[PDB]
Structures are given as structure tokens and as C-alpha cells.
């Protein structure tokens, strides 16, 4: 009757307190994990300066990884890159080739094993519990070069700002399969570089492409972690707004029920007293 | 042969054919990089821009005139307009030069590119300068490394990397002028 | 409140002044008139107020006006019961209020 | 209080099918056509069962939610999702101008 | 506009105002499909930026100061200019000035013709679109 | 503390308490504003952690057992021992040998001076901070 | 709303201890054997103070 | 949640104006000068409109 609305008010009030605390928690996490995102942006520059950027390559095998989140109050991030994953994957699979879809974060294994299920071989999680390190991303890249595809698509949300998260695809051509072929311009463009390695160019390109996969995978999950924090900071602001709006309507409903309660109890007392007096 | 012109602007039209018009086109990492390799410039004299990178820290994006890198065929100096190269670095000391002033970082490996537009890029994984490393544990680490040698291939490759890095670090700590 | 308003009305009508009239907690005027109406055996209105609520407030508030001789301006402290602006006493007081001065901590 | 992005994948399908069937329950009336403009729709019983079978089983997850709104039967849902996608392609059809007309 | 109805004077409407105001109410109906979640909640489409930056014009068209009622022939011309698209390049801060500029600058013969004929005739909408393209909408 | 009012207020309290409880009610109000953050694991920006530890010790300082009321000069030094930062800033498994250790270890002359003057005079707060720094806590 | 996974082992321990206390407050009754089946228990005062 | 660092100057002229506006609403009263020392100020309407 009139106690259920008061306990629902007491529910939504500390739900709003929870989400107001969670917004500042995610905001402090976004502020602390911004400098690492700014530092890791440097090392992805020389590899796309050297190897270029060729997303629409015709390959035989491609490992596509979608870097999702771990906990799921981000509010429209892990489904937006699932949409972007299928949108960039239908673009680049019309050659009759095999495609391996991977997800980093266990909110992507819940969203990717029902839309592309039989092409889903690997699921990685818990990468944001302590922090994101380069040895962790190098091990993840080692399980990515367990199989040897001709491309590595990395789907992640680039932390452009605290408001805007542009989803970014990044591609890594494996060396002898696609990289030595996709650089030929009347000869080659890589032949301008004087290889100063121990063994031949076919091995220094192998080391360079594995290191480029590790570098952009580390930067991808770091950018996606910062976008997770900055999207949770906005989703919890929306939850405070909604649980203040719901609380404001439910307060008026409780006031109407309270006024009607005193009126009906008083009318009952007057109707009892008018039968006797 | 260049009969397949892949790229970011060629990806956009195939994405406008096969992916729907509900979503804006995804970004690419070449949209965030203002400096390329073949687009000429950046030298303008005797200096040339350096890019000393670790995965966790940007160590220098200033403009130097001499860069000393520890390549696997030995040390080599990079002056203003070097030949374009891709130099695999061994453990050694990278030395930056601004003139009278110098920065001497000891790196752990990695690569170093010189590009046809005169820019250079040093891509290491851990670059600790020489006051941050102690000379007491490098000899303890080499004595714990070069003595116990497993004949297994993975452990002996790790041991070869250990004795190479610790020997270069021992030869680098007392060779400060 | 009618006593204080009469002392103000002599300054309005005879002196020809612009007198102020401060009613501390007009809700207590409403509550006292509700208690007088309840003691006289009258059936209470909505939530517990007098049936004469709008007219007992209007018998006070309509004598606070500007005439051709002078004016009475009234600053009434308003208490809001259970912080309900839709309670009949603040909702009936607010139909006469020409301004509102919120003082906050 | 949380948005649809925190729902399960099985529950987002429930919300989509329910928002389709609660637009599909609405209907224009022959007595309401004087103040609404749209003509009324009399719907036979078999058309209602055949339409709601198709929306329950999942045959019309392609069509948008507003294609179900204020239409007669399940045919008019498809014939409104056509008109809703001719019209977004009718952003670039022509530039309408009537010239040399004032002395006709 | 979503809750207030009038189902008896709907047939008792001035024609011309019935010619434009049905489209006005339809556009304000599909304006309330993006009402206060343009980019406030999660995302913005930028293909339905047009319905937002047109519903704001139709909202600012209907604002009207106190003690100044308008004849109906000067209201149907203002909603004609707001609906047919003669005010989309006017900024939202000055549509209230653009409306009085339209009413002042268009010649008063079209008001008498629309008031006497009681509808925007096909002989009248051509002259109205003629007189509506030579008005000096301020700013922009 | 948030719902308890006193309309007479600070004009009818101990002047030794008046200068020390004024910081206390502001610290407790700041602790009430941030009290949703207390049951979170990911630690915040260390300005809210400071009030969340300070107010959580100040609410422990206001506890009291039944039928043992305290004189006002002892509650004044007990609030001075907690609002001035002298309180158990070590890990708080030392509580029972830390709450009344102030009133059982500080020499009882300062209670006589604080009761007689009714105020924490400038000739007394020096010995107050001195005696509050040399507290024993022999249980650890 | 969160899920009891981030509470940093001081609030995650006070959930498990209080849940063991909630289950430990329950007791089979001698008069409730004929609709639960479990035999009843008499728990003495010094025997429940140490147990809690 | 962010600070004065991420405020635009378009959203910092509003802060620098609103702070001195909310200061300028304050005013010393004549009836308080018997215990506050500073004298009271009577502000005209035209002076209020001009000064704001």
C-alpha cells in the first residue's frame, strides 16, 4: 500500500548514491589511466610510418580480435564494437578465406559466440584486473601467432576524448604472406631501407611484424580500457539522471498516496462518529 | 607489381558497399600520425627529428644531430640525413646528441628505423639510463647466468640473451668518460 | 494575524503609508484556524485542514492590498509540511503569493 | 535506470519483439479518421493470428518498430517498411521548381 | 502538444491553417521521437539532426508574447514560412525576429486574399512563395 | 547528526567545545556527503579518502556506553584529540587501548584548567598538544 | 548492482562471515520434526556464545 | 569531477563572471552594524541594474 512506495524510494535513492559514487570512481580511473594511453601512442607511430596502413587486403587467413571490456557498466561500447566487428568483417571476407575471431575481455565472449560462433577460437579475459602490461600483450600476441594468418585485425575504441570514442581498426600484415607483396612499387618500397640485421630480411620482417602486433595490441587494450572508464563515467551520469527522475516522480506519487491516506482515514473517523453523535 | 591498391581510402568504398550506412567509417592508425616516411622534409639543416620510444614511455621527441645506436653488426652513428635503414639493436647504450649535451640510455634490444624523409625512430622495450642501473647486481646476475647453463634449447637461448645483455651492461657501466 | 493586519490597516488607510506586515509562519495561522474549525464540530476537508481553508486564508490575504490611500505589503514566512508543495495549506497560500524569497544554508 | 546496453542478448530480443507487438496491437479506426486523417482498418481474425505468429516466431526482426505502428495487418507492416525506406532514399530525388508559370 | 487534443474544433479549423498545421503537428510528432536524447543519453545520428534543427524552429515559431493575439491569416503565413522551409537557414536564436520580419516585409495583399478566400489557393501559394523568397531574414 | 537540530545552537555550549566541535560538524557533514564511497574497493583521489577515514574515526569518537556520562572538559579534550589529527592514525585494531587512553594518560591538571577557564586558552593548547603527543598505548 | 567482486577482502569477508552467521542462527525445533524431518536441537548458552 | 584544467575559456568567463556576481549579491545591512562593524548600504534600483 503506502510502505512499498517508501521502500522503493529508499531503493532508488541509494541506487542514485551508488551510481554517483561510480561516476567519480570511473572518472578517477579515467584520469589516472590517461597518461599511460598518451605514452603508448608513440610506439604505434613508426610501424604505420614504416609498414603503412592497408586494411582492405586480400588474404587467405585473418585473425580478427575485438578488444572488449571485462565489467559491463560501460553502456554501449562492447556492443558497438561488435557491430563494428561484423561491419569490418563482412567487408573483408569475400575471397573464400578463413577468419578467426578473438575477443579480449569476457564481455565480448558473451556477445560474439552467438553472431559468429563457429569461427570463434579464442577468448581472453582478466586483462584489466591488475593493469595492462607489455608482457601480457606479448603473450596474447604469441597465442595469436600460434596460428599463422596473413592479417591481424584489431578492433578497439580509440580514446579520442572523454566524450568521443572513435572505434579504430588496425591491421598487421604477416611478413612473407602479405607484407613483402603489398609494398611493391616498381620494385619495392622496402628496398629503400638498408637492412642492418643479423639474418636476412625475411626474418627481421618476421620479428618486426610480431613486435608490431604486440605494440598495437598493447596500445589497443590500453585505449579500450580508457574508453571503458570514460564511457562508464557517462553511463553512470545517465543512471544518476534516470534514478533522480524516477525518484522525483515516485516522491510525488508517495505524496499523493500520503494525502489520500490521511483523507480516507479521517473520512472513516468522521463517518464513525456521525453514526454515534 | 602493384595491381591491388589497398589502403584506408580504398577500404571506405568497400565498407560503403558491404557494411550498412548506419555506422560511420572506422578509424585507422594512419589517421593519427602526422609524420610519414616518404613524405620529404623534417631535416632543414644539420638536425633531424628523433623518436625514442618504449611501450610505456616516450623518452624523446626532440631534434638531435647525432644518434649512436647499438646495432647487431656494431655501433653506428646516425647523422642528419642518414641512409634509410632498419637496424636491429642489440643490448647497448643509445646516445643522443643535442650539441654539448648528451643523453645516454642503456636499452635492452629492439629496433631502430631511419626513414627516407630523414626522421629516425628508436623502438626499444626497456631503456634504463645508467644511473638507474646498479653495478653491483650486474656481476651477480652474470655469475648466476653464465655458470648454470641448461643444454635445453629454450633455456640456452635465454642464457645466451642473458650473457649478451649482462656483458654489454658490464661493459657500459665503467665506460662512462 | 487579523489584529496585526488591523494595526497595519490603520497605517494604510488613515496615515496613507506604505506599511509592511510580517506574518511569521502563515502555516501556523492556517493550523490555528484548522484547530478552531475542528473544535467547532465542523467536518474536516482534505488532508485534515478546515473546509473553510481557502476562504479563511482569503479573508486575511485579500485585505493585504494596495488601495488609493496606501499599501500593505506582506512578507509571510511559509512552512511546507513534510516538504509537500501540493499539501493544501502551501498550495492555498501560494495562490496569493506575488513573490518568493528562498533563504538557504 | 540502466539502459538497454546492460540487458542480456536473450532479453534484448524480448524487448525488440515486445516493442514490435505493442505497436502492432494499435490500429486505426473508421470513426477516428475524421480527426486523425488515416483511414480506418478492419482486421480479420486469421490475419491477426497470422501476423502475431510471425512476430512471435521472429519472422519480422528485419522490419523496424514503426512499420508495425497503426497498420491493419501483417501485409501493411511490410508495405510500410517499404515506404519508410523509399522515403530515406527520397532525400535526393529532385529539386522541385515550377518556372515560367505565372501567366498560365 | 502530445497531450492536448481538440476533437470537435478539428473539423472547425480555418482552411489553410488546416493545410499547413497538419504537417506541423506531424513534424512536431516525429520531433518527439528524439526529444531530450539527441546526444544526452548515448549517441547522435546526424541524419536526424534535421528533425532536431527543424523542431526547434517549429517550437520557436509558436512562442508568442503576452497580450498580442495574431489574426489567423497572419498565423497560417507564419507556419507556412516555418513549414515549407523558408526559415531553415535562420538561426534558432532569431526565429522570433524572423517571424515578425516575414509578417512585416510580405505585402498585405496576401493576408486579405487568404482571409477572404479562406484557404491557400493554388493561385495564392505561388505568389506567397514569391513574396517569401524576397524577405530579409536578419542575421544568418 | 544530519537530522538533529538545535535552534539555540552554539550560543549555549561550552566555549572550549565551541572552537573544536565547529570543525567536527563540518568534517562529519563532509563525511556524510561522501559516505557512499566508503564501501568501494578502488580507492579514490585521496582527498575523499582523507575525509572517509577522518569522519569514520570521528563517528567512533562519539560512541558512548550506557549510564556512564562524561564531564565536559573530558569530552572537549577527546574531541581535540580527534579533530586535530592526534587520533589513531595507525591501523585501527588498536581501539580499546586507544579511545580512553587520552583521558586515562593525560595528566588531570589540564582538566582542571579547561573546566575553570571554560576555554582552550592560548596558554593551554601548547600543553594540550604536548600531552596528546606523549600518549603511551602500551597494549601494542 | 556490482556483484561482490571488488570489495578488497575486508567487505568480501564480512559478507561471508555474516552469511555463516545468518545460517548459524537457524535451528531445528523439536516441535518442527513433523514437517521438516530433521531432529530438534537444544543449544545451551555457553555452547552458543563460543560457537558464535 | 574534472577540474578547472578541462574547462574551456568560453566556460571559464562564465565562472569568472558568476563568482563575482554571486559575491555582488551580498550586501552589508544597517541593522547589523551594531555588531559587525562595517556600515550598511542602501542600494537604489537604478544603481542595482547598472551595477549588474
Automatic annotation (TrEMBL), chain A:
GO CC, alphabetical:
mitochondrial inner membrane; proton-transporting ATP synthase complex
Q: Give the record's keywords alphabetically.
A: ATP synthesis, CF(1), Hydrogen ion transport, Ion transport, Membrane, Mitochondrion, Mitochondrion inner membrane, Signal, Transport
Localization of this protein: Mitochondrion inner membrane
Q: Does the keyword Signal apply?
A: yes
Q: What is its main location?
A: mitochondrion
Q: Name one GO molecular function term.
A: proton-transporting ATP synthase activity, rotational mechanism
Q: How does it sit in the membrane?
A: Peripheral membrane protein
Q: Name any one Pfam family assigned in the record.
A: ATP-synt
User: Mind telling me which CDD domains this protein's record contains?
Assistant: F1-ATPase_gamma (cd12151)
Family assignment from sequence similarity: Belongs to the ATPase gamma chain family.
Instruction: Read off the PANTHER family from this record.
Output: ATP SYNTHASE GAMMA CHAIN, ATP SYNTHASE SUBUNIT GAMMA, MITOCHONDRIAL
* Listed NCBIfam families: ATPsyn_F1gamma
What protein name does the entry list?
F-ATPase gamma subunit
Q: Which organism is it from?
A: Polytomella sp. Pringsheim 198.80
**What does UniProt list as this organism's lineage?**
Eukaryota, Viridiplantae, Chlorophyta, core chlorophytes, Chlorophyceae
> What is the name of the gene encoding this protein?
atp3
From TrEMBL, chain B:
Entry's Gene Ontology molecular function annotations: proton-transporting ATP synthase activity, rotational mechanism
Q: What is its main location?
A: mitochondrion
User: Mind listing the UniProt keywords for this protein, alphabetically?
Assistant: Hydrogen ion transport, Ion transport, Membrane, Mitochondrion, Mitochondrion inner membrane, Transit peptide, Transport
One GO cellular component term noted in the UniProt record for this chain:
proton-transporting ATP synthase complex
Location relative to the cell: Mitochondrion inner membrane
Task: Please provide an example of a Pfam family that matches this protein in its UniProt record.
Answer: ATP-synt_DE_N
Cross-referenced PANTHER family: ATP SYNTHASE DELTA/EPSILON CHAIN, ATP SYNTHASE SUBUNIT DELTA, MITOCHONDRIAL
The record's similarity note reads: Belongs to the ATPase epsilon chain family.
Protein's UniProt name: Mitochondrial ATP synthase subunit delta
Organism annotation:
Polytomella sp. Pringsheim 198.80
TrEMBL record, chain C:
* Residues annotated for Mg(2+) 1 binding in this entry: 24
Protein location = Mitochondrion inner membrane
Q: What quaternary arrangement does the UniProt entry report?
A: F-type ATPases have 2 components, CF(1) - the catalytic core - and CF(0) - the membrane proton channel. CF(1) and CF(0) have multiple subunits. F-type ATPases have 2 components, CF(1) - the catalytic core - and CF(0) - the membrane proton channel. CF(1) has five subunits: alpha(3), beta(3), gamma(1), delta(1), epsilon(1). CF(0) has three main subunits: a, b and c.
| Family of the protein in this entry | Belongs to the ATPase alpha/beta chains family.
Q: What does this protein do?
A: Produces ATP from ADP in the presence of a proton gradient across the membrane.
The protein here is known as ATP synthase subunit beta
- The organism encoding this protein is Polytomella sp. Pringsheim 198.80
Q: Which residues of the full protein are shown?
A: 262 to 366 of 574
Automatic annotation (TrEMBL), chains E, F:
Q: Which residues bind ADP 1?
A: 6-7
Sorted alphabetically, which keywords does the UniProt record give? ATP synthesis, ATP-binding, CF(1), Hydrogen ion transport, Hydrolase, Ion transport, Membrane, Metal-binding, Mitochondrion, Mitochondrion inner membrane, Nucleotide-binding, Transport
Instruction: Indicate the segments forming the ATP synthase alpha subunit C-terminal domain, all copies.
Output: 13-134
Claim: Hydrolase is one of the keywords in the record: yes
Which amino acids does the record list as binding ATP?
A: 64-66
State the GO CC annotations.
Answer: mitochondrial inner membrane; proton-transporting ATP synthase complex
Question: For ADP 2, which residues are the binding ones?
Answer: 7
Record family assignment: Belongs to the ATPase alpha/beta chains family.
What name does the UniProt record give this protein? ATP synthase subunit alpha
Question: To which species is this protein native?
Answer: Polytomella sp. Pringsheim 198.80
Task: Give the organism's phylogenetic lineage.
Answer: Eukaryota, Viridiplantae, Chlorophyta, core chlorophytes, Chlorophyceae
Q: Which gene encodes it?
A: atp1
Q: Which residues of the full protein are shown?
A: 423 to 562 of 562
